[PDB]
Amino acid sequence: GKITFYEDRGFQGRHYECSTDHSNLQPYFSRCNSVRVDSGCWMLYEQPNFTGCQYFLRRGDYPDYQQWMGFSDSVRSCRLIPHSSSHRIRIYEREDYRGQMVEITDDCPHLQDRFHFSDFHSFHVMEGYWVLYEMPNYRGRQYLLRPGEYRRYHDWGAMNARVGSLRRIMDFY
């Protein structure tokens, strides 16, 4: 997989070509205003060691940080997300998996409208990587969900319990 980050918008300035996970990109550029995803699915992180804001990037050219819904021009770590052949997630109503629950294998642009209940506080990712969004239609803050368990919002890096949409990381093309 390959990605290149540029310090200036419109693919200008100092840049860095990258093919792997990086817990700290500060040594190669101090800001990111544009990116070129040649191949792969990447999760950009605002701070080192995969913390702060998260941004999902699929192959394409991103002229401005706003094209990847960035809150700023900060990108300090990154993950090359693995290809998954299937996707399955269990959504619980209460934290710690308590309460009502639904199971899904498709994308959900609007969670609280689609199911028989509208409080979602814990997740159990069975297969695949997903992007949880704060607002319907894949808008707002983003949180990478990898296979595994998330009992409270604190587990998926969220500073808050807001969720409105969900999508399977798959591929752009």
From Swiss-Prot:
UniProt keyword annotation of Signal present: no
SS bond partners: none
Recorded GO MF terms: structural constituent of eye lens
Segments for region (Connecting peptide): 83-86
Tissue expression notes: Detected in the superior olivary complex and fibers of the ventral aoustic stria of the auditory hindbrain.
Record key words, sorted: Eye lens protein, Repeat
Keyword Protease: no
Pfam families for this protein: Crystall
GO biological process entries: lens development in camera-type eye; visual perception
Entry domain remark: Has a two-domain beta-structure, folded into four very similar Greek key motifs.
Functional description taken from the UniProt entry: Crystallins are the dominant structural components of the vertebrate eye lens.
PANTHER family noted in UniProt: BETA/GAMMA CRYSTALLIN, GAMMA-CRYSTALLIN E-RELATED
Family as reported in the entry's similarity comment: Belongs to the beta/gamma-crystallin family.
Name this polypeptide is given: Gamma-crystallin E
The species this protein was found in: Rattus norvegicus
High-level lineage: Eukaryota, Metazoa, Chordata, Craniata, Vertebrata
